[PDB]
Amino acid sequence: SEKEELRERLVKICVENAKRKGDDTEEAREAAREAFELVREAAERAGIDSSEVLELAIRLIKECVENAQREGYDISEACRAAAEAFKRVAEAAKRAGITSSEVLELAIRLIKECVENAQREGYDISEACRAAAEAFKRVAEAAKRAGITSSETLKRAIEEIRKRVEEAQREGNDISEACRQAAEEFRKKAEELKRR
Numbered sequence: 752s753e754k755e756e757l758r759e760r761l762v763k764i765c766v767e768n769a770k771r772k773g774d775d776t777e778e779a780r781e782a783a784r785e786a787f788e789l790v791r792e793a794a795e796r797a798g799i800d801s802s803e804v805l806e807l808a809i810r811l812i813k814e815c816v817e818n819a820q821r822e823g824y825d826i827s828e829a830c831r832a833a834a835e836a837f838k839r840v841a842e843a844a845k846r847a848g849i850t851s852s853e854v855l856e857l858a859i860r861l862i863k864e865c866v867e868n869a870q871r872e873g874y875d876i877s878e879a880c881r882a883a884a885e886a887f888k889r890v891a892e893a894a895k896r897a898g899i900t901s902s903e904t905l906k907r908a909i910e911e912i913r914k915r916v917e918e919a920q921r922e923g924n925d926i927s928e929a930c931r932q933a934a935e936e937f938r939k940k941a942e943e944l945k946r947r
Contacts, residue, residue, distance in 0.1 A: 812833040
């Protein structure tokens with residue numbers, strides 16, 4: 752099946768990257784298999800389990816794993832953390848009624864960018880995953896509360912977070928704070944919209 756194929760690809764990626772740097776390949780295979788099910792189930796429960804969304808989730812994991820290999824991080828840790836980050840995006844999407852393909856893609860790109868930035872700087876991957884996923888969760892929740900149904904509005908909110916994260920990266924400022932401040936500015940705007 753397509754899912755079996757996709758899982759096999761992720762296993763290959765994790766095992767090959769573990770083998771390259773002398774990490775435990777059996778742990779990496781296990782991590783890949785468990786990560787795949789974690790993301791599949793989360794997507795299914797959120798009603799977003801198109802093969803396109805599953806491919807994006809696997810791409811996120813792949814990129815985080817490949818960069819872990821480059822930057823001195825444990826392959827299985829990276830695999831798990833990326834999968835858990837996707838799970839939190841899916842959970843927030845479910846709670847807010849978000850199914851937009853473009854919104855989901857931007858949320859997952861934001862996670863990737865935060866993780867890559869953390870890995871470059873030698874910081875903890877899990878903290879970068881939390882900042883990115885929390886920012887999405889905050890925007891999603893604020894949009895739902897305010898009755899914002901527009902995909903363009905959500906896309907522009909996530910793009911603004913991406914823009915502030917890239918600015919912070921460039922200037923050597925804290926990425927997590929950039930995420931927090933940008934999501935909070937959206938929340939304010941949304942709440943004003945609802946009140947007014």
